Amino acid sequence: MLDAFAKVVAQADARGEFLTNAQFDALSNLVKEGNKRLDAVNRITSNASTIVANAARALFAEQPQLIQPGGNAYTNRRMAACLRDMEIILRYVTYAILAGDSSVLDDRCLNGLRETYQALGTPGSSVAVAIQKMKDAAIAIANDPNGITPGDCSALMSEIAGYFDRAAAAVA
Amino acid sequence: MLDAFAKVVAQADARGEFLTNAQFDALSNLVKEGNKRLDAVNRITSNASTIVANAARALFAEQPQLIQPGGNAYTNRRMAACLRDMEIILRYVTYAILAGDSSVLDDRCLNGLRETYQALGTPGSSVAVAIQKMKDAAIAIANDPNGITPGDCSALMSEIAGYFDRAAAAVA
Amino acid sequence: MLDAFAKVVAQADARGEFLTNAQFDALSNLVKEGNKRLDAVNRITSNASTIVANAARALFAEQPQLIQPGGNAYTNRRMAACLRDMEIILRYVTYAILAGDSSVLDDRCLNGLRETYQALGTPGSSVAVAIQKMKDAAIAIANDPNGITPGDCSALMSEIAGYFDRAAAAVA
Amino acid sequence: AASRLGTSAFSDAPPVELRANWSEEDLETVIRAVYRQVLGNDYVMASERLVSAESLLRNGKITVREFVRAVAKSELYKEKFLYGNFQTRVIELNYKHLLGRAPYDESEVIFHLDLYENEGFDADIDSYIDSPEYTNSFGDWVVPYYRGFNTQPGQKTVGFNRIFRLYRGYANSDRAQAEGSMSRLARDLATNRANTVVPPSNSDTAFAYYTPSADVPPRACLGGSFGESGRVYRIEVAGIRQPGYPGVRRSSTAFLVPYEQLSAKMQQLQRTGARIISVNPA
Amino acid sequence: MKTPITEAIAAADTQGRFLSNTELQAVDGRFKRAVASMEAARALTNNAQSLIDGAAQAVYQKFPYTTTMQGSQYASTPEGKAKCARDIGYYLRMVTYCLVAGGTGPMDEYLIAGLSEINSTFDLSPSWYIEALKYIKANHGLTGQAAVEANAYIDYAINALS
Amino acid sequence: MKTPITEAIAAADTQGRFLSNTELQAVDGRFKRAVASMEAARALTNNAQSLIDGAAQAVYQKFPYTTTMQGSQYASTPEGKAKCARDIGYYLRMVTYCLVAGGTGPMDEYLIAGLSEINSTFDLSPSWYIEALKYIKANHGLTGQAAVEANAYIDYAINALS
Amino acid sequence: MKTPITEAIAAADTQGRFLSNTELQAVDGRFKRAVASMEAARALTNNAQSLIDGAAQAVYQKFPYTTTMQGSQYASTPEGKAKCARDIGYYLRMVTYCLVAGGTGPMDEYLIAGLSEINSTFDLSPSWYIEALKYIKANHGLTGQAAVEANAYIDYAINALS
Amino acid sequence: MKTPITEAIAAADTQGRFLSNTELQAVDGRFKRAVASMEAARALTNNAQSLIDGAAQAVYQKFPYTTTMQGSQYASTPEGKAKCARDIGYYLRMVTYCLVAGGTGPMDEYLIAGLSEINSTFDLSPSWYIEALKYIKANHGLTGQAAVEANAYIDYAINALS
Ligand SMILES: CCC1=C(C)/C(=C/C2=NC(=C\c3[nH]c(/C=C4\NC(=O)[C@H](C)[C@H]4CC)c(C)c3CCC(=O)O)/C(CCC(=O)O)=C2C)NC1=O
Ligand SMILES: CCC1=C(C)/C(=C/C2=NC(=C\c3[nH]c(/C=C4\NC(=O)[C@H](C)[C@H]4CC)c(C)c3CCC(=O)O)/C(CCC(=O)O)=C2C)NC1=O
Ligand SMILES: CCC1=C(C)/C(=C/C2=NC(=C\c3[nH]c(/C=C4\NC(=O)[C@H](C)[C@H]4CC)c(C)c3CCC(=O)O)/C(CCC(=O)O)=C2C)NC1=O
Ligand SMILES: CCC1=C(C)/C(=C/C2=NC(=C\c3[nH]c(/C=C4\NC(=O)[C@H](C)[C@H]4CC)c(C)c3CCC(=O)O)/C(CCC(=O)O)=C2C)NC1=O
Ligand SMILES: CCC1=C(C)/C(=C/C2=NC(=C\c3[nH]c(/C=C4\NC(=O)[C@H](C)[C@H]4CC)c(C)c3CCC(=O)O)/C(CCC(=O)O)=C2C)NC1=O
Ligand SMILES: CCC1=C(C)/C(=C/C2=NC(=C\c3[nH]c(/C=C4\NC(=O)[C@H](C)[C@H]4CC)c(C)c3CCC(=O)O)/C(CCC(=O)O)=C2C)NC1=O
Ligand SMILES: CCC1=C(C)/C(=C/C2=NC(=C\c3[nH]c(/C=C4\NC(=O)[C@H](C)[C@H]4CC)c(C)c3CCC(=O)O)/C(CCC(=O)O)=C2C)NC1=O
Ligand SMILES: CCC1=C(C)/C(=C/C2=NC(=C\c3[nH]c(/C=C4\NC(=O)[C@H](C)[C@H]4CC)c(C)c3CCC(=O)O)/C(CCC(=O)O)=C2C)NC1=O
Ligand SMILES: CCC1=C(C)/C(=C/C2=NC(=C\c3[nH]c(/C=C4\NC(=O)[C@H](C)[C@H]4CC)c(C)c3CCC(=O)O)/C(CCC(=O)O)=C2C)NC1=O
Ligand SMILES: CCC1=C(C)/C(=C/C2=NC(=C\c3[nH]c(/C=C4\NC(=O)[C@H](C)[C@H]4CC)c(C)c3CCC(=O)O)/C(CCC(=O)O)=C2C)NC1=O
Ligand SMILES: CCC1=C(C)/C(=C/C2=NC(=C\c3[nH]c(/C=C4\NC(=O)[C@H](C)[C@H]4CC)c(C)c3CCC(=O)O)/C(CCC(=O)O)=C2C)NC1=O
Ligand SMILES: CCC1=C(C)/C(=C/C2=NC(=C\c3[nH]c(/C=C4\NC(=O)[C@H](C)[C@H]4CC)c(C)c3CCC(=O)O)/C(CCC(=O)O)=C2C)NC1=O
């Protein structure tokens, strides 16, 4: 696992060159906007439960086949599993946001995740739709401009969207 | 672990003599009233959760020091532990009732429970009080005369009272 | 493991109520002197290896019977174990200094050490002497007035002495 | 009640299964933790570590279960425990190191001992490793931990007592303990006898209270005792040293005392210096 | 012992669950069969002397060599005859115990456990006991379901010997 | 408890290494946040009565059935009203403990651990406490980053109840 | 699932031995009781609609607040009434399944597994289903041992919710 | 690596919980210290060549025998002097990686692991590199808390080699 700082230093170690001035200033820029990153992750994690719950209700309303008898989100045990996996994806994406890199998202998630869903027979496309619902919810809550110091964090929001997109593409 | 029939067989095997006629008839008497035994265990096990919950409310009303802060049944995880270790005693007593002997109750539940509680600090008097609270509720629920073909059950009720009492004395 | 803040919280939880103004002031005093605490722990950790090595040489010069044939610091395996144990005591004392509370020092490291040495046969008094050598060395290293912004630090140095003393007394 | 009992913090589970099963750092931690649990917190020197097993461990060819078995059957483990102790004592140590518990009843010793007598020691370790308990509580990717403290699995109450006989502190190692070189839970296991919990030492005087019932009063009073109002409290003590007339005799012992006299007796005991282990109603 | 009631209790205990209706139904079946079981046990024990002495003579007839050949394993001496009688009595006693317990428990704990080892060390050829078991199966003097259950347990023993 | 300081100590202990710059940086961050954290804690503990009494009335308004329906789980009886006051006070006390501790440790060990079992056995629906916590999160009367810290811990409780 | 036949099979499989007479007796008892069990199942399914509707009204009467309070987890909307008619139907269906299976297997696999999680995520209260199950147990209209078995499964669900 | 950010992430991951304020506080401390850390890294890298050559001469002076005795593990040959320069350059490059990463991760994973094995097989006594690192720690020419942290990392390496 390599966060953003760790990632840049690891590639620089592979090349075997002292960190160059450009890399130094890139890292300084990362630190300068670090407070924003922390604020965004705090706000997302504070509403984690509501995000997952609302997204789940929406998914089962839009795709009733899942909760109909014989569907993969039936039997109340598989329903618990589905909620668990949605919140797991949210948890690892929040880890990724705090890190600044996608290394954690790919290691301990999405790696041999497509295959597991494919073998279980659970539709991966529906999983992607669920991830997208959570993406909209999280980006809205993470860009809410009320209750906080003013600023512009659109870059960080696009980064969050990128992480969610990566996951949804890997599972579907 | 010795059930009634096994107990008779074991004590006959130690002496090395074929089962005597007296022992035969004793076991036959146990079989004759076996349906009563099964009815009693069925009733108690059917209402286990309510039995434990009601007795717990009573215990904390009669001994408020448990709920009061700094005690042993405070902080909501120790509350969970207290409920767990009341229902555990109920479970092993039901095992005993079905068996017809106290062997299982004294071998796998009450065999040193006193010392464990001593080490933890859990007040040993209060657990006995809790078992008694459960005792009256369970005996009443098993002796409920409505819902089944009427008959005699006083002997069996005394027997289960004996099991509860044995545990309550051994834990104090 | 309890740190200073956690210690105050745990006492307050035992008594219920709500954090008193006095307790607030105590914690504020802890934080206003926190930079000192961190500096001290950094200095001790940076010279850990030399502290242990120098104290070991002194111990074996002062009490040669330990390293003479047939003594408990003989055969090059027990010598390795002795060096290990000295370093471990230093490590858990360093933990205690950073925490501000001696709970960690007595909860893992000193928890059972006495009987361990009693069974091994290792002279506990000699171990105490070694800990005291380390005490003087580390306190001198931390109290070195050159190399950092000057200021009052005597209270923290006395606290470091207190931790080392607790360990040395518990082993002997 | 954590510090006195000895369970400082055993409050999580260290798996190694990951996309980064090595995880570049976490594997170091897992290897250390396996060494601490399997070898009984023995101080393994660097030269004698089982390098061959760790090779396969990072490679992923072997799981944590295979790593634990490799250590358990390697001569590193055998020299410390297997060869040097009574066989029943070895069974106890296996239960402590591999399944994180203590023998719940005599049948456990019967079964494991018979395996050792016929099949060999390797098969005995095999039985512990692949027993349903190891397969469930741990998962071929989870280092064994002392789950005996927690009661969730389903166990005889005595188990709690018994595990505290084997674990005599965070610092302690089973190669080096007060009662070592002889069976610690053998006489009790045949009689299904409970054991008073001996707290490990913690920055105060320690007096390991052996409890051979060969010469002690019974757990119960078995009578009316003095007959004074109130029941009979059994008081234990270990370090009686001041009044040695022939030599005190039976320095560690218990006395059944009627309630009214307890206070007086207490001070007498404190005068000798023995720290009362327990005061249990009889 | 591994008695039906205790086996159900242990199965529930390993999962920490109250006794559900499955186990209760099982024990009910045990009680329903217990009437015939007790009848058969009483019949076997009241006629035990005939079934022990006759079985001894039956093995003496099927194996003449066991009552003549010199050696401790044989019953040529009167002391050996006493040993033979005691062992046949053990088998009959165990069958009665198993019948009363309603399950294989007693038989496995007090007989079958290590039976091969003991018969292979003290030179006690299992064929002797299996013939004796056959005799007691034939003169069991039991009818109806009482007969069938008893003979089943006897058959268990013979299959365990071989 | 899961206190930042203790978490760093445990991270160093599981690897066996002396406290590195990573752990020191972490605890320094905690000390730097502690000024605002202690301000927030003072605010909650000095205004406790308003917050708790108002929360009690808020839950009575949100769920009117809870102050009418007969039954021990409800606060229709005066004894139940006392219970409600005591428990809301416990929640606020734990949040103040967490604020001063600098982490979520105290509420993990003295609130959340086994909260599901209790809330199910005594029929105490978590939604009641969720709404009460919402009231406290709105009336705490904090500002700046102190408000952020207090709201973070309150929302931890809210999500744990859910 | 935990069907009597299959658990006997698993018990023999763990030991690695062919099915002994004890297991065969157990499954014979199962087959003997199956006639009554299936008659009771037919009776329960023939009046299923009336039972489900009556239970839905019973919970509406015990908890009027649930039919007025606005929100997703309430039956104040026609969609919520549909959800009630769905879930109560599921519980009755599972009871019939348990009756046919002669064990709690179906109940565990299709209902109890993760029930605790779901009732917290979707803000459902277990008490609702408990009251509905009580209505079902009182109006099942079965008699005899079959009635006993059905009530046992219903109470299993009741205690699982609690 | 053991980077403070990822250490907090791992601490939350092993307990399967969303990032609490504990981990957020830790990362905040890292960002606060990062200003000085990056200043220190820039300082060390900008004069890296000067410090490398100075350290090489320092080791040559402290251990003259290393420049004279014949053997593969000596710098008597120009190729040996080149390898010595390469090694001390590796140490300085790794310390400047560790400064930017924010913890002792880089030093631990890319060095300090099996260092004992290598130093024992090729017979490079650690004392040489220890003295070289001491020279670097005395001539780094930093000031303030930046100097403090750079020294701390260098001394971590020194104690690891010992
Ligand atoms: C414990 C972890 C942690 C958190 C959560 C945290 C919050 C935090 N946010 C801050 C600033 C800030 N936070 C924002 C955040 C935003 N601006 C926007 O327009 C958005 C809608 C939103 C981001 C999505 C901005 C713009 C600042 C001030 C400028 C800056 O720091 O970059 C600051 C610095 C000044 C201050 O407010 O005191 C802190 C300390 N600090 C922490 O140490
Ligand atoms: C199957 C047989 C069995 C029994 C009997 C049993 C008892 C038992 N109860 C325990 C804990 C406990 N038990 C209680 C119970 C109580 N608190 C109170 O206020 C009351 C007086 C009392 C209930 C009436 C508490 C509070 C603890 C936790 C103590 C602690 O962590 O400090 C523990 C310690 C380990 C654990 O937490 O599970 C055991 C072993 N465990 C078993 O497996
Ligand atoms: C699934 C396991 C199982 C159960 C539950 C079961 C119940 C059962 N209880 C019965 C009767 C009875 N039930 C009782 C019970 C009582 N008498 C009292 O005064 C008390 C209030 C109460 C104690 C619970 C009595 C006395 C009889 C008649 C005699 C008997 O069979 O026990 C009968 C026989 C007559 C009848 O059909 O009513 C059965 C079959 N049978 C079973 O195989
Ligand atoms: C990586 C996390 C981290 C650490 C470790 C840290 C330490 C730290 N402690 C400090 C303060 C201090 N440093 C001392 C040091 C001393 N004065 C003396 O006379 C003694 C010889 C000695 C005691 C060992 C004192 C007294 C202060 C307090 C005054 C202040 O805060 O500036 C300072 C500011 C001035 C200085 O460098 O001393 C820093 C940077 N800051 C951090 O962010
Ligand atoms: C059956 C006995 C046995 C063998 C053979 C074995 C091989 C083996 N060598 C390994 C590593 C390695 N082996 C090498 C070896 C080499 N690097 C080079 O430049 C050379 C060309 C070559 C030596 C001549 C390297 C570099 C690694 C490290 C891979 C890594 O961690 O990135 C690994 C990876 C996991 C680990 O390091 O434990 C395995 C499994 N393991 C075993 O238990
Ligand atoms: C160091 C190796 C070692 C020894 C020696 C040992 C002894 C030992 N012998 C046992 C049994 C036994 N040992 C005997 C021994 C004898 N009975 C007699 O009549 C004779 C006088 C004598 C043989 C000549 C008996 C009868 C039992 C069974 C006791 C019982 O089940 O109650 C048991 C009980 C548990 C079991 O049966 O599995 C142990 C622990 N255990 C060991 O690990
Ligand atoms: C993390 C807390 C902790 C501590 C402290 C601890 C102590 C500890 N020290 C040990 C050994 C030892 N301890 C010493 C200690 C000394 N000998 C001397 O001459 C000196 C006076 C002294 C050093 C100052 C020695 C020589 C051994 C090895 C004995 C042996 O294995 O034979 C052992 C067991 C034997 C072994 O090393 O395998 C333990 C368990 N264990 C722990 O888990
Ligand atoms: C008649 C049978 C009998 C025995 C066996 C006996 C043993 C015995 N020896 C004692 C003392 C002692 N025994 C020793 C013995 C030793 N010290 C050492 O350094 C050596 C390792 C070891 C001899 C080789 C010591 C030092 C004490 C005093 C302990 C103390 O005051 O702390 C004590 C403590 C009370 C006292 O001193 O009176 C007892 C009970 N007493 C008896 O009445
Ligand atoms: C309760 C379960 C149980 C069984 C089954 C059992 C068998 C048993 N039979 C034995 C001996 C014996 N058993 C016999 C039996 C026979 N001789 C014959 O001619 C017949 C064919 C046969 C009877 C059918 C004889 C003669 C001995 C003595 C053999 C000897 O001393 O070498 C012995 C040797 C110890 C002794 O001398 O008694 C055992 C252990 N012991 C048991 O505790
Ligand atoms: C320190 C951590 C901690 C918590 C959180 C805790 C909760 C807790 N609340 C309880 C009861 C209760 N809680 C309430 C609370 C309420 N009643 C209402 O009407 C409202 C809607 C609501 C307040 C908003 C009531 C009425 C009871 C008593 C229920 C009964 O007697 O059955 C009980 C049962 C024991 C008792 O009677 O007190 C526990 C264990 N206990 C703890 O130790
Ligand atoms: C096959 C087994 C099975 C069960 C048990 C089950 C329960 C279950 N009930 C649900 C919802 C629900 N359950 C109810 C039920 C009720 N509303 C009330 O007012 C009453 C008091 C109560 C009925 C008597 C309602 C209204 C919802 C919708 C809540 C929502 O969409 O947020 C949901 C969420 C998905 C949905 O909207 O359907 C599940 C998963 N699902 C299952 O697959
Ligand atoms: C990034 C981590 C890393 C380190 C630390 C490292 C060190 C390292 N230095 C080596 C050699 C060497 N290094 C030196 C260096 C020196 N000559 C002197 O006079 C001085 C005292 C000293 C410099 C301070 C010499 C002489 C050898 C050759 C030894 C031989 O071939 O026998 C070798 C053996 C293989 C080789 O020739 O490269 C290693 C592995 N390599 C690494 O990848």
Numbering used by the authors:
A (entry chain B), B (entry chain L), C (entry chain F): 1 to 72, 75 to 174
D (entry chain Z): 6 to 287
E (entry chain K), F (entry chain E), G (entry chain I), H (entry chain A): 1 to 140, 143 to 150, 161 to 174
The authors write:
Cyanobacteria, glaucophytes, and rhodophytes utilize a large water-soluble, light-harvesting complex called phycobilisome (PBS) for solar energy absorption and energy transfer to photosynthetic membrane proteins (photosystem I and photosystem II; PSI and PSII). PBS is composed of phycobiliproteins (PBPs) such as phycoerythrin, phycoerythrocyanin, phycocyanin (PC), and allophycocyanin (APC).
The PC rod is formed by PC monomers consisting of α-subunit (CpcA) and β-subunit (CpcB) to form two PC hexamers, inside which linker proteins interact. As CpcG1, CpcG2, and CpcG4 show similar amino acid sequences, CpcG2 assignment in this study is tentative. The interaction between PCs and linker proteins in the PC rod is asymmetric, which is induced by the interactions between CpcC, CpcD, and CpcG2 in the rod. Although there were no major differences in the structure of each PC monomer comprising the PC rods, the interaction of the linker proteins in the PC rods caused a significant shift in the arrangement of Disk B in the PC rod. Notably, the arrangement of the monomers in Disk B is significantly altered relative to that in the PC rods solved by X-ray crystallography. Disk B interacts with CpcC and CpcG2, and the “CpcD-like structure (residues 234–287)” in CpcC specifically interacts with the CpcB region (residue 109–122 [orange]) in monomer 9, with this interaction being very similar to that between CpcD and CpcB in monomer 3. One difference between the two PC rods is that the Nostoc 7120 PC rod (Rs1) does not contain CpcD, and the arrangement of the PC monomer in the vicinity of CpcD in Disk A differs from that of the Nostoc 7120 PC rod (RMSD = 2.79), suggesting that this change in the arrangement was caused by the interaction between CpcD and CpcB in monomer 3 of T. vulcanus. Similar to the PBS core, excitonic coupling between chromophores contributes to the energy transfer in the PC rods.
